[PDB]
């Protein structure tokens, strides 16, 4: 076996699990004890009256599945590596586990024509409150930012417990402690070098480091379609926009340069081949104004489009990485969608998450666990499928945070 095993799944085994009894699950929140109006009254005087604030929220259950098939003659011959049905079941379960692990991070439930309800569920990236975001603008993670995130969490009556980061960021962070090693003069014969940090002590609690093999950087562009059921490619046109709040100038050395742009069309089945590449030149005074993209749907696609991924290259670079993701306006033939890029995410960067991992903050509700179901016999072929229904819920969005645009050079 040259592929990953069950020990490489981390976030799925740690999140708490609860049972679900419907496709809509509701919960209530307490926001305030009263509005601030002063409490000093005076002798024998009737004081004022306060009121509290409450809210009610809901979450929607989604579905996942896959199908495996084995032919009748294959089940009759002798096999060297054991039974084939058990092997196929194991492969299907492991594939589903990997998909669940990554969907718990990068899911999005607003990807549908017109912004309607999609087929995915929301992940950690979208459920965290936008205020608890720290942008590093393309710089290495240091020890200060951990205290910064801990402060962000604790000022909202939380308690940091875990930090989830990719392996490259872990290696880069551990590299920063190398110049702090010291050797005593009467040296022995043989030493162990290299410093690895597993835990951190902040002014608002203690944090544990949890490297994840399936947490990655921005996805690079791929020239081949992920599925034959993906939609057809379209066209792309780009130029300078008219916005006044773009963040192209936040990079080191400014934001003036030449950038490459591309789009890919997506549905629930897979991803299409990339569109034509467009080069856009940004002057020194245009860093405040965004880049406007015009996207045209394919004319004779065999499957409809649902959302669009935007790819951007580095400043004066050649390789393209995914920086944006949004839904189409219409799925009709020759439809036109417009979008303005404001450089919210830099190309070739990483992302990390920290927050309180307790059942009172985050949980996963299961309508049914992973299970198998047989299929009808349409011929001399044995078929079956594997399913799970569920949705993750975060009760306290501001007891989490995330770092964006982290730079790391470990692999290269």
């Amino acid at each position: 076996n040259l592929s990953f095993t069950d020990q490489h799944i981390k976030f799925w085994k740690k999140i708490p699990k609860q049972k679900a009894y419907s496709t809509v699950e509701q919960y209530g929140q307490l926001l305030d004890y009263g509005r601030s109006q002063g409490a000093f009254v005076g002798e024998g005087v009737l004081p004022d009256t306060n009121d509290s604030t409450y809210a009610r929220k809901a979450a929607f259950v989604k579905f996942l599945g896959t199908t495996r098939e084995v032919t009748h003659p294959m089940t009759l011959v002798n096999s060297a590596f054991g039974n084939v049905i058990a092997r196929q079941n194991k492969d299907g379960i492991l594939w589903m586990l990997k998909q669940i692990e990554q969907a718990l991070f990068w899911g999005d439930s607003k990807l549908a024509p017109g912004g309607q309800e999609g087929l995915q569920f929301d992940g950690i990236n979208k459920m965290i409150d936008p205020e608890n975001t720290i942008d590093l603008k393309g710089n290495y993670l240091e020890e200060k930012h951990i205290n910064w995130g801990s402060q962000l969490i604790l000022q909202n009556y939380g308690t940091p417990t875990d930090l989830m980061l990719p392996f490259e960021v872990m290696g880069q962070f551990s590299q920063e402690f190398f110049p702090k090693e010291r050797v005593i003069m009467p040296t022995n014969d043989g030493y162990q070098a290299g410093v690895v940090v597993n835990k951190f002590m902040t002014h608002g609690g203690e944090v544990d480091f949890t490297p994840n093999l399936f947490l990655n950087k921005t996805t690079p562009l791929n020239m081949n379609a992920s599925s034959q059921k993906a939609p057809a490619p379209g066209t792309l046109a780009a130029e300078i926009g008219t916005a006044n709040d773009a963040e192209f100038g936040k990079q080191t050395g400014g934001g003036a340069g030449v950038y490459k742009y591309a789009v890919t069309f997506n549905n629930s089945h897979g991803e299409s081949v990339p569109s034509n590449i467009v080069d856009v030149t940004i002057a020194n005074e245009d860093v405040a104004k965004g880049v406007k993209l015009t996207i045209t749907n394919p004319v004779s696609t065999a499957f409809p489009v649902e959302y669009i991924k935007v790819y951007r290259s580095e400043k004066d670079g050649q390789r393209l990485y995914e920086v944006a993701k949004f839904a189409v306006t219409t799925d009709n033939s020759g439809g036109v969608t417009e979008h303005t890029d404001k450089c919210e995410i830099l190309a070739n960067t990483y992302t990390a998450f920290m927050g309180e991992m307790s059942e009172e903050v985050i949980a996963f509700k299961q309508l049914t666990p992973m299970m198998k179901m047989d299929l009808a016999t349409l011929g001399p072929v044995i078929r079956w499928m594997i399913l799970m229904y569920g949705v993750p819920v975060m009760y306290a969005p501001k007891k989490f945070m995330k770092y964006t645009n982290i730079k790391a050079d470990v692999p290269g």
Partner: peptide, 29 residues
């Protein structure tokens, strides 16, 4: 077929959604 949707408003339920009952967690967060 008979499908259970994601409709929240009780006055917009139709089809299989009319058979669903309310599900509320009993702990206040």
């Amino acid at each position: 077929a008979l499908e259970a949707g994601h409709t929240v408003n009780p006055l917009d339920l139709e089809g299989g959604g009319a058979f669903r009952v309310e599900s509320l967690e009993r702990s206040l967060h």
